[PDB]
Every structure is written in C-alpha cells, then in structure tokens.
Design a protein around this ligand. Structure first.
Ligand code: MNR
Ligand code: NO2
Length: 152
C-alpha cells in the first residue's frame, strides 16, 4: 500500500485540485477525450462535442468533471480503506457504462498531466510518485472487481 508519508503527499496534492475542482475536472476530461477520442463515444451526452472549443465551452462537461473528481477525492481521503466507495463505481463502470480498465489508465495519466500543466514546477518528484501510487491503487482495486464480474 502507500506509506503514511505518501498518503500525506497525495492529500497535499489534492488540495490543489480542491481550490478549482471544476477547472481541474474539465481539463482532465478534455485531456482524456482529445488524447483518446474513443473515450468520448462512451458518453452519449458528450458525443456531440466535435471540437476542443466545443468541449471547453460545455458547461455540462465541467459539471461532469466536478462529479468525477469529487468522487475520486472521496476515495483518496479514505487512504486505501475505500471498499464501500469503490465497489459501486467499479460495478457501474463495468456493467452499465462498459468502461475498459484501459480507459481508467488513460484518465489516471490525464490527471498526472493536468497537475503538471496547471502547477508547473509545483508538482514535485515525491508528489508525482505518491499520486501515481494512489491512482494505481484505485485502478488495481477496480480491476479486481472487473475480474470478479468477468468484464473485459
Ligand atoms: C472513458 C470513460 C470513463 C472513464 C475513464 C471514467 C472514469 C471515472 C473516474 C476515474 C477517476 C471516476 C472517479 C468516475 C466517477 C463517475 N463516473 Mn465515470 N468515472 N462515467 C462514465 C465514463 C467514464 N468514467 C460514463 C459514460 C458515465 C455516465 C455519464 C452520464 O451519462 O451521465 C460515468 C459516470 C460517473 C459517475 C456517476 C455515477 C455512476 O454512474 O457511477 C461518477 C461518480
Ligand atoms: O468522466 N468520467 O466519468
């Protein structure tokens, strides 16, 4: 798992996200969609977004970004003790939304990129290591539930 020190880093980094949850959420989703257009096809409500300008202009996309990062923040603040929080998400993403685990790798990478982009020189090597571990833990625990369901 993560050490106490590592969790403290993760939640310190998370402070940056919480100052502007919508802005971070928006940029994370745009990074995902532009980098991996197939991901956009999983969202009936974002399929109409034909350009980054349109994405940037979408208030509903920002709204969804807030929902997303709020959920992730809840999970992170449990410091690995997140079974109750993670289970329903694993299940809706496998069974309803059909999100391959690869897309969760994509969005994890997007979060790391966005943190650097918004906080250049202020997301240090130790912070990136800790945040990376936390996101891998999240991914890995979801993947365990995906395996249970035989999804993908
Ligand atoms: C590639 C696409 C997908 C990725 C990656 C992804 C990654 C993540 C992610 C990782 C950090 C978190 C946290 C996350 C959290 C959520 N997510 Mn998700 N999610 N996610 C969807 C696609 C994806 N998610 C879709 C599609 C919906 C339904 C949206 C709608 O039509 O209103 C949804 C909905 C949701 C909801 C609403 C409740 C529900 O349906 O369970 C939350 C919360
Ligand atoms: O964008 N993930 O729901």
């Amino acid at each position: 798992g993560l050490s106490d020190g590592e969790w403290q880093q993760v939640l310190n980094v998370w402070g940056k996200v919480e100052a502007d949850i919508a802005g971070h959420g928006q940029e994370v989703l745009i990074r995902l969609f532009t980098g991996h257009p197939e991901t956009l096809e999983k969202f009936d409500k974002f399929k109409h977004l034909k350009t980054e300008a349109e994405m940037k202009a979408s208030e509903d996309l920002k709204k969804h970004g807030t929902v997303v990062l709020t959920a992730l923040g809840g999970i992170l603040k449990k410091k690995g003790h997140h079974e109750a929080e993670l289970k329903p998400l694993a299940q809706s993403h496998a069974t309803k939304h059909k999100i391959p685990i690869k897309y969760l790798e994509f969005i994890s990478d997007a979060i790391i990129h966005v943190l650097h982009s918004k906080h250049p020189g202020d997301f240090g090597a130790d912070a990136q290591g800790a945040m990376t571990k936390a996101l891998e833990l999240f991914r890995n625990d979801i993947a365990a539930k995906y395996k249970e369901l035989g999804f993908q």
